[PDB]
RNA sequence: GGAGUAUGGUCACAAGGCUGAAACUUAAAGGAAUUGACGGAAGGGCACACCAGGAGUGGAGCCUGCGGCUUAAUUUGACUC
RNA sequence: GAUCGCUAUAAGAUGCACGAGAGCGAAAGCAUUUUCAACUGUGUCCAUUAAUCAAGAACGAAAGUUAGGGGAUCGAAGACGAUCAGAUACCGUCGUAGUCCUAACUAUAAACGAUGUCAACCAAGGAUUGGAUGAAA
RNA sequence: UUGAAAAAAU
RNA sequence: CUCUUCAUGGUGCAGCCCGUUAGCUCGUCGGGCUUUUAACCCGAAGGUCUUCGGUUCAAAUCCGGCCGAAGAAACCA
């Protein structure tokens, strides 16, 4: 009937991590220290240019959407972020794909944030003077 | 010989300005030569917003923008599609 | 089973703040480790006057609470930036920006640098004396427009952080 | 589980050369817009099959 | 052009900095704009140019032209569209 | 037990958005908040005390030198993996000097407005930075 | 993603 | 002496510890792409998988002496 561990209807909070060479769907409790599920990009996918494609990212924002109803979690707050430390604050294409995915789930969509960390006064950055030619 | 009257800078009662990194090159570009582009965007696209809304758990969650602003080199500029290469006379448009 | 039941606990806020229960929080099971390590973890954040005030007319703020502080949302901070103003900023941590007038014409409202010091210490030494923390928001950066509107008009005054 | 949609119309022919066609279509179970990419000679009236209708077509 | 090089002097721990030729060689070197051509530069259209295809040729036997080889001579013009 | 998520700690460096053909400075240069110069005002004072300057002197980006501290990020040299006919380069990973501070050197830049300093005259127009002076509370 | 070269005077 | 491993075109590497008739590059010849050359692509030939037996419906390929190299360990005529 219900596997231990599980509980009543539960929020949960959502970290959809997508840069332009992977995406993490990663989510948590409220607290965030105790993590439930964690599928990326390249878990779904045998080919490394294939760990960005939305379909990549879309597929594992629905294992993660199972889960957490198995689990009993059947909210989460999203918080979409990118690889925007010093590099391009612009989260990848798999940003997008899984988090319609996991509404398409049939799951309560709670308050969106964008948490990409801006830096206010930042290191070096990778490439030189010249930059990436 | 000369093609831009303010050398392609909007720099006038100054003799050294901070250089920032370009978005796309990481490449080290003065302040006031660079590309300015500012960008407003939904967080969720057009596409996808309904989608949220047939399932939301707030009574009037409205969605957030984005809010970046992005500098770019010439090279990547024009590549980019940024900005065009313009007619002689169309070169001292400023609007 | 990775889970194998564990267990899972409540959150309460101080009496004072309408809800007094924000959700559910997992551990581990006693061992010769000890379960009541819920001690420190007081890290959950909920948007926080939108969902534990049960009003979305304070739904742009993020508190957080110990078993702490009170932070600005990231949306709300960018929005209020203009880019033909001028940004004033002390330390608790508030900001305000220079407003436009009705029967202004002239793009930019820039204030001097003497003008920026006198609402910047206007906004000291009202954020002690007024130094519970006065709860809620009740408009009080509401004699810091009315205070600095005598040297400056300014519109955008939020409280962004406290630690 | 094959779900049809309705063409509604032509957004344009994308795909290097022209051999995909842009069109913006309708289901008529829940009268939902979804954007597709077509091969094949398609116009305004005829209606489209689409065995999946879970990913959007915009194309970056 | 030789060349900011040799030599002389001077400064520096040094790299080098400042001053600074000649022999010899050569009818040009260069500046701004014009027209054309070209761009692995941008924009707009077109062609069986390609796409969706059909028939194929290239593989085999034979006919025929070209090169080569041969021979007394194997007459010769044409060699990307 | 990586990538990922939530806290706490220590140094290093940096100073986003505001930030602009806006300001200051002789030039180089100057952006977290808490001695000098300049304009304006003037029924103040001196009375030619001024301008340009061989020689001479001070300041002078970055890199570089010497000796300490610091050493996070990035990274001339260098080591790998690609690409290539080759690649000792552009592309990816790692990484010494260096990048930061102190003391002493160095004195060169597309050090450019490629436009020497001082003075007189000089068409039309909108706007801006800082004062003064009228109206507008 | 890779695209090196085209002897002198007319 | 005991245990273990390997051998394949001119060359170097593949191959299935069950098996049904052996490949990828360089090397040779010819053709294709190009206005032409160099790069680039393709086809053919090139070994029958060290040597002899069993193992069956068939063995580079499973097992045995034999070759001819390699690693560890031992040694009273």
Redesign the interface.
Same mark, same amino acid.
């Given at each position: 009937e219900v596997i231990p561990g599980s509980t009543k209807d539960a929020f949960g909070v959502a970290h959809i991590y997508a840069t332009f060479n992977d995406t993490f769907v990663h989510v948590t409790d409220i607290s965030g220290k105790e993590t439930i599920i964690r599928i990326t990009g390249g878990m779904r996918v045998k080919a490394d240019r294939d760990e960005s494609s939305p379909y990549a990212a879309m597929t594992a924002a629905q294992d993660v959407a199972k889960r957490c109803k198995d689990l009993g979690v059947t909210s989460l707050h999203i918080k979409m972020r990118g690889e925007g430390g010093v590099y391009s604050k612009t989260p990848g294409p798999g940003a997008q794909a899984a988090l319609r995915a996991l509404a398409r789930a049939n799951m309560k969509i709670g308050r969106i944030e964008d948490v990409t960390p801006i830096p206010t006064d930042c290191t070096k950055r990778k490439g030189g003077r010249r930059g990436r030619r | 010989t000369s093609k831009r009257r303010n050398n392609g800078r909007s720099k006038k009662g100054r003799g050294h300005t901070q250089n920032v990194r370009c978005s796309h090159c990481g490449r080290c570009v003065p302040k006031d030569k660079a590309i300015k582009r500012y960008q407003i965007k939904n967080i969720v696209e057009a596409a996808a917003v309904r989608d949220i809304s047939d399932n939301s758990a707030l009574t009037k969650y409205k969605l957030p923008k984005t809010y970046m602003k992005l500098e770019y080199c010439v090279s990547c500029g024009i590549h980019g599609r940024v900005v065009r290469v313009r007619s002689r006379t169309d070169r001292r448009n400023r609007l | 089973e990775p889970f194998s039941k564990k267990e899972w606990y409540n959150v309460k806020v101080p009496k004072n703040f309408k809800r007094r229960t924000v959700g559910q929080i997992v551990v581990n099971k006693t061992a010769g480790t000890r379960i009541a390590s819920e001690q420190l973890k007081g890290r959950v954040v909920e948007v926080n006057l939108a969902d534990l005030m049960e009003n979305e007319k304070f739904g742009a703020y993020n508190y957080k609470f110990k078993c702490h502080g009170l932070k600005l949302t990231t949306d709300k901070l960018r929005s209020i930036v203009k880019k033909w103003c001028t940004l004033i900023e002390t330390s608790i941590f508030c900001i305000g920006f220079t407003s436009r007038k009705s029967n202004q014409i002239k793009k930019t409202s820039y204030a001097k640098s003497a003008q920026i010091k006198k609402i910047r210490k206007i906004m000291n030494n009202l954020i002690t004396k007024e130094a519970v923390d006065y709860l809620r928001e009740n408009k009080l950066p509401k004699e810091i427009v009315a205070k600095c509107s005598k040297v400056f008009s300014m519109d955008n005054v939020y409280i962004r952080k406290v630690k | 589980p094959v779900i049809y949609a309705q063409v509604t119309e032509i957004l344009g022919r994308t795909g290097s050369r022209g051999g995909v066609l842009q069109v913006r279509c309708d289901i008529m179970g829940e009268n939902r817009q979804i !954007?597709r990419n077509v091969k094949g000679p398609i116009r305004v009236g005829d209606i489209l099959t689409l065995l999946e209708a +879970? /990913? +959007?077509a /915009?194309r !970056?």
């Open positions: - | - | - | !954007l +879970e /990913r +959007e /915009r !970056l």
